[PDB]
Amino acid sequence: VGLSANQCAVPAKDRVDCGYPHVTPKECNNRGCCFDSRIPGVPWCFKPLQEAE
Ligand SMILES: CC(=O)N[C@H]1[C@@H](O[C@@H]2[C@H](O)[C@@H](O)[C@H](O)O[C@@H]2CO)O[C@H](CO)[C@@H](O)[C@@H]1O
């Protein structure tokens, strides 16, 4: 698995959108991003935490 659980534990308020409305989980995965639909009204597809570039 590429992204770890800890990389995707991003508080809702800090999430940076990596997708767009109605983006699918697979599209999100294919961008190297985190998917979470549990919390409404915040990005469901968001950038992971990782070491900086
Ligand atoms: C209000 C908000 O931040 N919306 C996000 C979020 O949208 C989800 C989903 O993709 C939509 O189809 C649905 O209608 O609303 C969801 C949120 O409740 O996530 C997407 C993807 O990250 C963002 O582009 C939206 O801006």
Residue numbers in the entry: 4 to 56
Manuscript text:
The trefoil domain is comprised of three loops (foils) formed by three disulfide bonds.
Following mTFF3 surface lysine methylation, a crystal of the mTFF3–GlcNAc-α-1,4-Gal complex was obtained and the structure determined to a resolution of 1.55 Å. Only two side chains, Asp20 and Trp47, make direct contacts with the disaccharide: Asp20 makes a bidentate hydrogen-bonding interaction between O-4 and O-6 of the non-reducing α-GlcNAc, while C-H–π interactions are made between the indole ring of Trp47 and the reducing-end Gal. Trp47 undergoes considerable motion between liganded and unliganded forms. The larger GlcNAc-α-1,4-Gal disaccharide, which is the terminating structure unique to some mucin-like O-glycans, bound to mTFF1, TFF2 and mTFF3 with a Kd of 49 ± 4 µM, 44 ± 8 µM and 65 ± 5 µM, respectively. Using our ELISA, the dTFF1bio-N14A mutant was found to have reduced affinity for pMucinred while the dTFF3bio-D20A mutant had barely any detectable affinity for pMucinred.
